[PDB]
Amino acid sequence: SHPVLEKLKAAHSYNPKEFEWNLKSGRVFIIKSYSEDDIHRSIKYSIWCSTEHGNKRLDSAFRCMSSKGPVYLLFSVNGSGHFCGVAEMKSPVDYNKGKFDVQWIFVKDVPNNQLRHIRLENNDNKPVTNSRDTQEVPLEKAKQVLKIISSYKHTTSIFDDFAHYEKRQEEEEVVRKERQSRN
């Protein structure tokens, strides 16, 4: 067990046994992450950043949902074949690129084969697992997705490789510093 991961787990209740997937109101979006390193950083710092267009869509949705219901984000790394968790969006986008606060709720790997029966009528009836970044999920389909993610008995999560990702970040920082030093 990594000491940083222990601090995180003491400060956050991940994978809560009591999650309300039967949302009365809300908006739910797919997040397609470029890498596991970004997921790891997001969990560590409770922040996310989409593209310029994605940030615009999420910023608008959050501001339109103020005091009406939550905005949930369903995370999957491009090409990974499985969703890796769920966070709630907690702030509008701050442009000093941008960034917004997130509160991670589920940190767990859910294979796409467990979700691909759910099709999005607002994305040409494609499986929810075939979505682009910031695709909005209609609420009833989002309930089905959240029910499965919340109940799934996962065998892995990104936390299994926590030390690995910590090392990746530290070493890259060293490399970056040295590169900057030489210029």
Side-chain angles (χ1 to χ4, degrees), residues 13 17 20 26 29 36 51 60 64 67 75 77 81 86-87 117 120 123 129 133 141 146 148 165 170 173 176:
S13 300
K17 290 190 175 124
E20 182 56 89
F29 300 88
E36 274 77 19
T51 63
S60 183
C64 292
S67 292
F75 282 80
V77 174
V86 174
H117 63 293
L120 300 196
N123 188 29
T129 51
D133 189 52
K141 306 302 173 63
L146 286 167
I148 287 163
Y165 285 115
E170 289 168 356
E173 184 61 22
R176 182 165 38 246

Side-chain angles (χ1 to χ4, degrees), residues 8-165:
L8 284 166
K9 291 181 175 177
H12 305 277
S13 300
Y14 298 122
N15 300 336
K17 290 190 175 124
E18 300 292 310
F19 176 79
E20 182 56 89
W21 55 264
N22 191 12
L23 310 177
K24 291 174 191 295
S25 69
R27 299 187 192 184
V28 178
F29 300 88
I30 305 293
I31 297 294
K32 294 303 296 294
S33 171
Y34 286 147
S35 71
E36 274 77 19
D37 301 274
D38 289 343
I39 302 293
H40 178 82
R41 170 177 160 102
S42 180
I43 299 168
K44 264 172 63 178
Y45 297 110
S46 291
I47 58 164
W48 189 252
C49 183
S50 183
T51 63
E52 279 178 354
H53 181 69
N55 276 348
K56 181 187 176 302
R57 291 171 44 80
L58 297 170
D59 191 40
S60 183
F62 182 87
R63 295 177 178 274
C64 292
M65 286 304 296
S66 184
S67 292
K68 294 187 332 173
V71 176
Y72 289 118
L73 308 174
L74 318 179
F75 282 80
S76 173
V77 174
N78 286 334
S80 69
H82 71 269
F83 280 68
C84 57
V86 174
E88 182 177 357
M89 188 174 180
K90 297 303 268 191
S91 79
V93 176
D94 178 13
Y95 299 101
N96 315 336
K97 350 84 173 204
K99 77 181 187 54
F100 57 87
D101 296 334
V102 297
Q103 171 62 54
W104 279 85
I105 297 170
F106 290 99
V107 179
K108 57 194 293 184
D109 291 341
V110 177
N112 280 359
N113 59 41
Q114 301 294 293
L115 296 164
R116 65 166 64 109
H117 63 293
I118 298 163
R119 289 153 272 162
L120 300 196
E121 63 270 34
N122 63 333
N123 188 29
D124 295 309
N125 282 290
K126 291 169 151 59
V128 62
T129 51
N130 188 44
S131 304
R132 291 179 178 88
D133 189 52
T134 75
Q135 171 70 50
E136 188 173 357
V137 183
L139 196 67
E140 285 305 309
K141 306 302 173 63
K143 292 182 192 178
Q144 293 163 21
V145 172
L146 286 167
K147 177 182 194 276
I148 287 163
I149 293 179
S150 63
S151 307
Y152 189 70
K153 308 289 188 170
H154 62 296
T155 50
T156 69
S157 82
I158 196 173
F159 284 165
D160 296 332
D161 301 304
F162 191 92
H164 172 254
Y165 285 115

